[PDB]
Design an enzyme around this catalytic site. Structure first.
Site, PDB file in Angstrom:
ATOM      1  CG  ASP A  25      -1.856   1.137   1.273  1.00  0.00           C
ATOM      2  OD1 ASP A  25      -1.778   2.041   0.425  1.00  0.00           O
ATOM      3  OD2 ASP A  25      -2.713   1.118   2.158  1.00  0.00           O
ATOM      4  CB  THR A  26       2.149   3.363  -2.801  1.00  0.00           C
ATOM      5  OG1 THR A  26       0.907   3.550  -3.490  1.00  0.00           O
ATOM      6  CG2 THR A  26       2.874   2.180  -3.430  1.00  0.00           C
ATOM      7  N   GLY A  27      -0.047   4.227  -0.345  1.00  0.00           N
ATOM      8  CA  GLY A  27      -0.719   5.303   0.369  1.00  0.00           C
ATOM      9  C   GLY A  27      -0.630   5.275   1.887  1.00  0.00           C
TER      10      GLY A  27
HETATM   11  C1  LIG Z   1      -5.070   6.914   2.070  1.00  0.00           C
HETATM   12  C2  LIG Z   1      -4.891   7.148   3.558  1.00  0.00           C
HETATM   13  C3  LIG Z   1      -6.245   7.342   4.231  1.00  0.00           C
HETATM   14  C4  LIG Z   1      -4.048   6.050   4.209  1.00  0.00           C
HETATM   15  N1  LIG Z   1      -4.723   4.742   4.240  1.00  0.00           N
HETATM   16  C5  LIG Z   1      -4.052   3.780   3.347  1.00  0.00           C
HETATM   17  C6  LIG Z   1      -4.998   3.471   2.194  1.00  0.00           C
HETATM   18  O1  LIG Z   1      -4.329   2.733   1.172  1.00  0.00           O
HETATM   19  C7  LIG Z   1      -6.215   2.712   2.710  1.00  0.00           C
HETATM   20  C8  LIG Z   1      -5.862   1.265   3.026  1.00  0.00           C
HETATM   21  C9  LIG Z   1      -7.131   0.493   3.270  1.00  0.00           C
HETATM   22  C10 LIG Z   1      -7.513  -0.524   2.401  1.00  0.00           C
HETATM   23  C11 LIG Z   1      -8.687  -1.226   2.645  1.00  0.00           C
HETATM   24  C12 LIG Z   1      -9.480  -0.918   3.747  1.00  0.00           C
HETATM   25  C13 LIG Z   1      -9.085   0.093   4.612  1.00  0.00           C
HETATM   26  C14 LIG Z   1      -7.914   0.801   4.375  1.00  0.00           C
HETATM   27  N2  LIG Z   1      -7.107   2.641   1.576  1.00  0.00           N
HETATM   28  C15 LIG Z   1      -8.271   3.278   1.531  1.00  0.00           C
HETATM   29  O2  LIG Z   1      -8.702   3.986   2.422  1.00  0.00           O
HETATM   30  O3  LIG Z   1      -9.027   3.095   0.309  1.00  0.00           O
HETATM   31  C16 LIG Z   1     -10.397   3.442   0.300  1.00  0.00           C
HETATM   32  C17 LIG Z   1     -10.589   4.050  -1.074  1.00  0.00           C
HETATM   33  O4  LIG Z   1     -10.717   2.918  -1.940  1.00  0.00           O
HETATM   34  C18 LIG Z   1     -11.255   1.802  -1.217  1.00  0.00           C
HETATM   35  O5  LIG Z   1     -10.436   0.638  -1.375  1.00  0.00           O
HETATM   36  C19 LIG Z   1      -9.948   0.151  -0.127  1.00  0.00           C
HETATM   37  C20 LIG Z   1     -10.613   0.985   0.955  1.00  0.00           C
HETATM   38  C21 LIG Z   1     -11.221   2.175   0.247  1.00  0.00           C
HETATM   39  S1  LIG Z   1      -4.827   4.174   5.756  1.00  0.00           S
HETATM   40  O6  LIG Z   1      -5.196   2.790   5.712  1.00  0.00           O
HETATM   41  O7  LIG Z   1      -5.860   4.900   6.401  1.00  0.00           O
HETATM   42  C22 LIG Z   1      -3.482   4.272   6.617  1.00  0.00           C
HETATM   43  C23 LIG Z   1      -3.152   5.407   7.359  1.00  0.00           C
HETATM   44  C24 LIG Z   1      -1.976   5.441   8.104  1.00  0.00           C
HETATM   45  C25 LIG Z   1      -1.131   4.333   8.118  1.00  0.00           C
HETATM   46  N3  LIG Z   1       0.016   4.340   8.840  1.00  0.00           N
HETATM   47  C26 LIG Z   1      -1.468   3.200   7.395  1.00  0.00           C
HETATM   48  C27 LIG Z   1      -2.639   3.171   6.655  1.00  0.00           C
END
Ligand SMILES: CC(C)CN(C[C@@H](O)[C@H](Cc1ccccc1)NC(=O)O[C@H]1CO[C@H]2OCC[C@H]21)S(=O)(=O)c1ccc(N)cc1
Lengths: 99, 99
Positions: A25-27
């Site tokens: 997860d690059t985000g």
């Molecule tokens: C983008 C930011 C909010 C960072 N997020 C990582 C991100 O990749 C999350 C990672 C993620 C992935 C799945 C479920 C929850 C979080 N993805 C996400 O929120 O995606 C949403 C938009 O598209 C959908 O696909 C997946 C969830 C939806 S995060 O999970 O909240 C996060 C924040 C801080 C840290 N240290 C680690 C992770």
């Protein structure tokens, strides 16, 4: 390996003697795993994502094998809905984005 | 370009005639942008991440230029803490993960 993004970049990892699947997860700045048994001592911490915040346990210098590549670093453990390998570990395994 | 992950992979995008900075986010299924003015009709939707869910507005067939590469697709708008380019658009610009 090269990984395209038509599907979730899910990879098998081994940590704490246990096998799990986790999203490259690059985000994500930091690695965060669902609730699991880990050996060490830990510090309370909170991380922020899309829907607000969650409380996690911070574990430092934890060994992870991500797709057969070892890395040691911080792992957060808590109520994330998905196991996430973040940039703190991705840099160790030489992972880049390319377009 | 090849992008390493020691820093956040932020890129400049143009959408709806406006310039923004967004995260290339392999962990995000869908593209979600902070509140902004976008032309057209839309539909209520809820997406879930680490801290729970947020309500968004779903816009289809939206043109985005990401690092000078055009893509057309779905863009969610709502109270995300950061602008995220998700896999629905990353695939269109030929973005891959390599290690
Ligand atoms: C983008 C930011 C909010 C960072 N997020 C990582 C991100 O990749 C999350 C990672 C993620 C992935 C799945 C479920 C929850 C979080 N993805 C996400 O929120 O995606 C949403 C938009 O598209 C959908 O696909 C997946 C969830 C939806 S995060 O999970 O909240 C996060 C924040 C801080 C840290 N240290 C680690 C992770």
């Amino acid at each position: 390996p090269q990984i395209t993004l038509w599907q979730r970049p899910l990879v098998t990892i081994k940590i704490g003697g246990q096998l799990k699947e986790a999203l490259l997860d690059t985000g994500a700045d930091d690695t965060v795993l669902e609730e699991m048994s880990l050996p060490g001592r830990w510090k309370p911490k909170m991380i922020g994502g899309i829907g607000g915040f969650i409380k996690v346990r911070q574990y430092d210098q934890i060994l992870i094998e991500i797709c057969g590549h070892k890395a040691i670093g911080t792992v957060l453990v808590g109520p994330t809905p998905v196991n996430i390998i973040g940039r703190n570990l991705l840099t160790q395994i030489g992972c880049t984005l390319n377009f």
